Amino acid sequence: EDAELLVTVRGGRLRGIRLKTPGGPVSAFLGIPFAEPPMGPRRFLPPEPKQPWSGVVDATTFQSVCYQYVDTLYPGFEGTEMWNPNRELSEDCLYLNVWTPYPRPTSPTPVLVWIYGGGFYSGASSLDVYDGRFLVQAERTVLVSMNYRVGAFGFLALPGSREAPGNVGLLDQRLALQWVQENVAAFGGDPTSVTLFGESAGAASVGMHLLSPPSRGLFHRAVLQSGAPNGPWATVGMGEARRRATQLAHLVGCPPGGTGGNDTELVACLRTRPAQVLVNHEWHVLPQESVFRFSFVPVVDGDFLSDTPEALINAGDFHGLQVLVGVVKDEGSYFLVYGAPGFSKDNESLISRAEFLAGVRVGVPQVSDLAAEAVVLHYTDWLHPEDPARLREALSDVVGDHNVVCPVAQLAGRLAAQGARVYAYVFEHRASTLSWPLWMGVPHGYEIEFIFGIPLDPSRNYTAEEKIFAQRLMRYWANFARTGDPNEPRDPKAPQWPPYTAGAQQYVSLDLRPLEVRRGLRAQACAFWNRFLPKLLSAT
């Protein structure tokens, strides 16, 4: 037994495991319980801190994945199954993982806290692409990642009641952040240099912690990848959250016909149902047929979020804060094979204009007929209004701009103009091992494997240029964690990454080629979403 695999924390002792990288070993502590199991009477309730334990807790393997829907659209397909749970499903899932270099750093080291995405209905910290053994070995930093409750178990909200207050999945993340403040020093980490970074729903979660006062004192830097809290999918109304929760209870037989009419007996009936029963009816509570919309998401309850995320961003101070935001080239292509008519991953998806007009109503739900007419005007090439290849790219840009790119550009503009130093990027490299069709380009979620240094894994068929590209990306994220600046504090030979300002709107392209500075995060297209369309809906 080695001396660096035994660590004592405020709850007790843990035995870690020594992972192996092509360039040196690394210590890991996988499966640390940071909360009591939210089972039985504690379902839908905020997390309670883990009670101290006797003996040594085995932290050599990942723990259970929180109960979640499992994607069955393309069974056996690598592109979809790489995001499915790789452990057993259980409500006993509130566990975090810590990677630390070997030998353990004798000086305090910056800490990176990863929050997985998955539309607030799925995801796990044990996926292969979230392996932090390569980022910790190459850049000698401390990586922490936790599981949080997703779906109804983490975001079912009956606003007003105390049996289902909502946003408990966000409280799972906050409790894990407090755990890092109280225990990351035992692993060689600096609790005064914590960098939150997440992707999609994790990026939205990172943004919601910026807007929540109790969570702001737990980290110092933020990285939002392909997501933002002001997105049209990230939050839901107090009344809509009550309707979605009530219909879910109706589908599972709650309340028993017909006694009961208050939230106390409604939640009491939900707590008796098996976990899989609630999951099988999760998608049946959405109001409309749509893509990029999810049943149970964070709610604006006045507690965790005192107001809407857009309001908190406009009227907030962000001085002394470094933020790194960015998107991929084709944000919307991934979500079109999940409901848009005429789209299939097994053909070229050469849609007609009739299918394009129907896809706009699916990609942009809850809009008037006039608002839909404005969308098809701005995204139609009127020289070739019937070209299937251009209509395919157009609908991909419609979903991408409406859901990811423009809410990110809106957030990045307000952050830089209110004190924060913001850096922006656009990931434009398609991995050579990508199993999705070519017409999707660089889809949503496929920059994560390069940030985590997955191409360094010799058992995978990546190219030599992609391995160098992975190390360069790991340097950017690490430099931003230590200094708050992605540039190398002493490098003059490499091109510089200029900050993003509301006026110049400068960003860089991440590719196999060196850095290239550009201007405008789709400024012309996002002016329609952020400026005009709000006013087009105010007048019905």
Active site residues: 200, 331, 444
Per-residue contact track with ligand LND, 501 to 520, x per CB under 6 A? --------------------
* Residue 80, token pair as written in the block: 């979809």
- Beta strands in 103-230, from DSSP E residues, in sequence order: 109-115, 142-146, 189-199, 221-225
Q: What is the nearest approach in angstroms of ligand LND to the Cβ of residue 339?
A: 6
Per-residue contact track with a copy of itself, 275 to 314, x per CB under 8 A? -xx--xx--x------------------------------
Among 2, 88, 348, 381, binds a copy of itself (CB under 8 A): 348
* Residue 339, token pair as written in the block: 């409901």
Q: What is the nearest approach in angstroms of a copy of itself to the Cβ of residue 478?
A: 40
* Of residues 76 and 503, the one with the C-beta less far from a copy of itself: 76
Q: Is 378 annotated as a binding residue?
A: no
436 binds ligand LND per the rule CB under 6 A: no
- Beta strands in 372-490, from DSSP E residues, in sequence order: 421-427
From residue 254, give the alpha-carbon distance in Å to each of 67, 214, 279.
Answer: 20, 35, 15
* Of residues 391 and 478, the one with the C-beta less far from a copy of itself: 391
291 binds ligand LND per the rule CB under 6 A: yes
DSSP label at residue 236? B
- The answer to whether the bond into 232 is cis (omega within 30° of 0) is no
- The answer to whether the bond into 492 is cis (omega within 30° of 0) is no
* Of residues 84 and 501, the one with the C-beta less far from a copy of itself: 84
* Of residues 68 and 205, the one with the C-beta less far from a copy of itself: 68
* Of residues 85 and 119, the one with the C-beta less far from ligand LND: 119
Stretch 71-90 residues interacting with a copy of itself (CB under 8 A): 72-77
Residue 498 interface partner, choices ligand LND, a copy of itself, none, CB cut-off 5-8 Å depending on type: none
Among 315, 350, 370, 377, binds a copy of itself (CB under 8 A): 350
Among 251, 268, 371, 536, binds a copy of itself (CB under 8 A): 251
Among 33, 47, 110, 119, binds ligand LND (CB under 6 A): 119
> Alpha helix locations (H) across 184-212?
201-210
Per-residue contact track with ligand LND, 312 to 341, x per CB under 6 A? -----------------------x--xx--
Q: Which residues pair with 440 in a beta bridge?
A: none
CA distance 127 to 119: 16
Q: Which residues pair with 18 in a beta bridge?
A: 27
CA distance 314 to 486: 26
* Of residues 44 and 343, the one with the C-beta less far from ligand LND: 343
CA distance 83 to 390: 29
First to last CA, the chain: 70
Among 22, 23, 41, 253, binds a copy of itself (CB under 8 A): 253
| Half-sphere CA count of 507, side-chain side, radius 13 A | 27
Among 6, 10, 58, 70, binds a copy of itself (CB under 8 A): 70
* Of residues 337 and 415, the one with the C-beta less far from ligand LND: 337
Residue 350 interface partner, choices ligand LND, a copy of itself, none, CB cut-off 5-8 Å depending on type: a copy of itself
From residue 224, give the alpha-carbon distance in Å to each of 172, 202, 221, 426, 430.
Answer: 19, 8, 10, 12, 20
* Residue 329, token pair as written in the block: 């080239």
- 189 and 109 Cβ atoms separated by less than 8 Å: yes
Q: What is the nearest approach in angstroms of a copy of itself to the Cβ of residue 74?
A: 6
- 496 and 387 Cβ atoms separated by less than 8 Å: no
Helix (H, G, I), strand (E, B) or coil at 434: coil
Per-residue contact track with ligand LND, 249 to 288, x per CB under 6 A? ----------------------------------x-----
CA distance 277 to 122: 16
Alpha carbon 351 to its chain's center? 30
Q: Which residues contact 249 (CB under 8 A, 6 or more apart)?
A: 255, 266, 269, 270
- 83 and 127 Cβ atoms separated by less than 8 Å: yes
Q: Is 334 annotated as a binding residue?
A: yes
Q: Is 179 annotated as a binding residue?
A: no
Q: What is the nearest approach in angstroms of a copy of itself to the Cβ of residue 358?
A: 15
Q: Which residues are annotated as a binding site for galanthamine?
A: 83, 199-200, 334
What is the contact surface with a copy of itself in residues (CB under 8 A)?
70, 72-77, 250-253, 257, 273, 276-277, 280-281, 284, 344, 346-348, 350
Q: Which residues are annotated as a binding site for huperzine A?
A: 83, 130, 334
What is the contact surface with ligand LND in residues (CB under 6 A)?
119, 283, 291-292, 335, 338-339
